[model samples]
Target: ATPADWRSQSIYFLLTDRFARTDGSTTATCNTADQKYCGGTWQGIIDKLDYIQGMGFTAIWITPVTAQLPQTTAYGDAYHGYWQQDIYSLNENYGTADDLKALSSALHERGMYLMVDVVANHMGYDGAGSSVDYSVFKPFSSQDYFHPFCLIQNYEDQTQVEDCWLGDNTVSLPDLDTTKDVVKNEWYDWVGSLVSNYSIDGLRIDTVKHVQKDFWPGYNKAAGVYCIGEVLDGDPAYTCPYQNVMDGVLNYPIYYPLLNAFKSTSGSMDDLYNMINTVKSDCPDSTLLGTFVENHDNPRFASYTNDIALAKNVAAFIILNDGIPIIYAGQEQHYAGGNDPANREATWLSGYPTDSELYKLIASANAIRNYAISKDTGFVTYKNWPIYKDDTTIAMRKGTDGSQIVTILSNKGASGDSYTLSLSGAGYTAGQQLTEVIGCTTVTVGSDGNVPVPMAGGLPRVLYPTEKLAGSKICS
Candidate 1:
């Protein structure tokens, strides 16, 4: 079972096939263009639980484990597990139902959670012009079970986006008839049983926007846990509505600006700051949002710029920012692959570099995050206070009267010069002592309770009260 305080947890996301191979099979190799299975299994994940836990992640999000069609589509294999052929049975390629139970048990034993990805939008395709054998779908065996085939050509049209197919002409990606009572009931029952059977703590719903918005509350109610959906859009107007339907969203609206500001020299800090402000004012619950800098669908942060320091700064932003931080696998190792399958590399190939700078940064960030949230009083919740912002530098303070945190970052590249920045109105008296957690720099509150510190180097700096507060660990 998942802890009730799931919003406070940090998530580590991984593609099942590209993570590790536990069956001792070397025949399956990594290839982005081939788009086939790379041989990762549930046992593989169990063996490497320590690797992920060592990074201070409290939860893991994995791809779908439901059964897939045995046949490979034009895109290659159903290795990524999005193609749902049978929702009732666990995919044999991944492992047996017993293996899934073991995975859930292992995570629970470690005081962690298992958040499985699920698809309700579409089913696997044999190919274009080929008749879909609905009998193969187990409980959903009938032509009426799916929407009529129509390629999605207009994303602006909600009806087309919801009912139309998503893939190419080579394979007819069939969309589901989620609006129907029978279909809705079947999905609700299937998801609830799936979660209870595996003791799942949370669910990461796929193509959430494609289905009717009203369909989620009941679906989530059945699972009886946190259900975060993939809104997959960058517009706050488009993405914020889904939060009303489900527990939370992937926070794609914040993602674009975050990448623009931090992913090399191409973006601005002001843009990121503005985006956060809008989200705070508009999003249903910013705290429950899934904050991420990189994921399987996007290019790696390292791909934009190989500066380890800059990448580490982004990691700091995600963890300390006001949301549930999600660090995609291979991101800590600085994988520079660009685009879909390329972005999803085998973590085993890198030998799970635990000593990498990004890995260490994440461990530190998680430590600070875990420490800060632990001090939660009914009234002392974390709040964002804008410290400073410009084209090159951005700083903010988080926390209430007794506990506050200050974070600063730079987009000026490595050669950026040191600058003095002031932060005020963040629960402090004029004479209180302060220390930069990441750098261990000491400072005192200036007149009017404002703290001024030198933001040197290109990396990020996090500051906390010198005296231990209610919800934070002292930097050592």
Candidate 2:
């Protein structure tokens, strides 16, 4: 069954091929430039569950488990799991079916949910696009099952975007004819069995807009799980429509704005503020969206700037904002790889260290979120509203009364000057005491019904009511 409580769960996303190895060796070299499998396995992830859970994530989203194009392609290999050749079989590169089942069992034992990435819009093929053999594909073993060979020419053309192929002639991703009833039924049944067999709690759908919009409702119903799609568009008008079709989408509409606002000191905070408001008003349920700053497909936030303080601000927004937070692996370590294979660095190289500054900040932020959810069941449902916003900083608050949390994000780099932000609409009464969860410091609301946020070193701040801190263990 779909996990109804997914809204409260913060996700840790990792490519199965790069997360860890079965032996758990940190000394192994995995050059991202190689663009091939680095030996991470299901058991490797199982061994590192402690590292993930310790960061306060309640769920994990992994790369596609389905088999990919067998031989190496011009672009390299299907190590990242996006290229799909067979839907019926698990990728041997990761592990056996038993290993995968064990991974599901292990996560359930730890009270965590699994979200598997799935691809239905197309099947992968090697060699020339025109000379591909269709018989090798499972179930979809005929030319009739796919759209006529054509590469996507214009992204703005809805017809080409939906019906045309994704890759080039060197490694073609044959677009499926999802409008066909036979194709739709097969996909429905396959996904239904896939979820039940693996005990998959949810789904993170890929290339959502690449498939026709009408295909999703039935597909989602068949999965019987919470499904969040990847729309990849930057405008709310373009991305929000998918939310009406699927359960939610990866908040791409806000992703670009966030990068522009926090990637550097000169980026605009008002743009991020405006985008959030636009998404809230446009989407059916903005809170269900997958909020993130980085993912397997994009450049790492650290690639823009190595400023740890800026990364913390972005991390804080993801954890505290209105949506399901997704932290791509190696983000906490401040990995600065750019684009494709570079952005998909082997996380094992970081040794899964818990002492990193960003790692600690993520832990504290998740702890505060969990505390708020415990105190108020509607905490996840509460919309985050900006209490204050300026050229460089924006402070937003979520939850109600005793469970409320206010997060202050700044684009100012590590050496940014310290300043006091007097928030007149912070919802807290005058003279109330709040604990800054990140720094373990106490702050008091002024008698003038204003909360004075003392920003130091330009780092982000998450404030929780001091009275609610008894059992959270954030400062203790």
Candidate 3:
């Protein structure tokens, strides 16, 4: 069954080809530049479930499992799993049908959910756009099922963006004519079978904006699960409408501003704050949106700036913010790859170390969040309020009175100067004890109801009532 409480999940996103091998070997070399498979499989993910769950993630989102074009194109092989040639068959490179079912069953046993990435936007083909044989694709083997081949020239044209092809001439992706009833019914039936057969709890839909908005409601209904789409636009007006079409979107409206605010000390916090308000007003429910600082499509946050402190601040905001949090694989290890193949690093090369700085921070943040949810069932639904915002810092509070989580984030890097912030609006009572969960430091509210936060070394701080730390094992 679909997880009704998906908003409380912190997702760990990974490309199956780059996550781990079946042997659980960390010493193997996986050159991302090669743009080919690295032998990671469903069993590989099964073996590393503890590593992911240890970071407090309750779910995992994997790349598309559908079969891809067999021949390598001018670009490279479809190791990233975006190119889909056959929807009926699972990518043999990843694993078999039974193996996938075992992976799903294993996650269900641990109370975790599985979110498989699906691409219904187009069908992949190699060679010239004219040389493609339509007979090869399964279920969609006829040329009438696709739109006339034309490269997308204008992104601003909504009709062209939805109807035109996405890739270049050498590696063209034939856009499906979803307006046709035949294609829509096939997709609807395919998604329903995919979900029921695998016991998938949710779906991470790819290239959602490429499809007409009207096509999603029926598709989502057929899947019968929580569906979050990738609406890659940066404007709230453009991105938020997707929330109305589907269950939720990837929160790209806030992603660009978030990077601008935290990538450097000179970045603007006001921009980030303004976008936050804009999204909340524009989107149906901002809490249901997926909040992320990094993903498979973009450059790593570390690529923007190698400052670990800034990354920590970004991580804190993602987990404590108003939306569902998603952390891309290797983010905890600080893999600083720049583009397509580069951003998709083989995570096993990092040795899946549990003690990495960002890993520990994520685990602690998740622990605090899970504990807060246990204390207050309404915690995930509570709207986040920005209590304060400055050029370099923003403090946000969520949850009700006692279970509230107050997070202070700074763009200041590790070499930042030490200072004190007297936050009277942080909603703490006089003499109330708070625990800085990241550093595990005890803080006492002032008699004047001011929570004086001493900032040093530019690290982010998450504050929870010290009295609520009974069995959370957060600071203890």
Q: Across residues 1-476, which tens digit of lDDT does each residue of candidate 1 receive?
A: 33246778899999988887886443446877788787899989999999899888999999999888777777788888887788888788778899889999999999999999999888886777247777777677877888887888999999999988888667666788999999999889988999989999999999998998989999988888899999999999999889998888998998998888887765788889998888888988787789998998889888999877688789898988777889999999999999987897888888777888888888877876777677654212354556678777778777766567778877866666777777665557788887776766778888877778776668788777777643444465
Q: What is the lDDT of candidate 3?
A: 0.90
Residue 184 local lDDT, model 2: 99
TM-score of each: 0.94, 0.99, 0.98
Whose TM-score is higher: candidate 1's or candidate 2's? Answer: 2
The CA lDDT of each predicted structure is 0.82, 0.91, 0.90
Could you give candidate 2's per-residue lDDT for residues 185-241 as a string of tens digits?
Answer: 999999999999999999999999899999999999999999999998987888999
Model 1: residues with Cα > 4 Å off, grouped in runs: 1-4, 23-28, 378-381, 469-474
| RMSD (CA, Å), each prediction | 2.3, 0.9, 1.0
Colliding pairs, model 1: 260-267, 375-471
TM-score of 3: 0.98
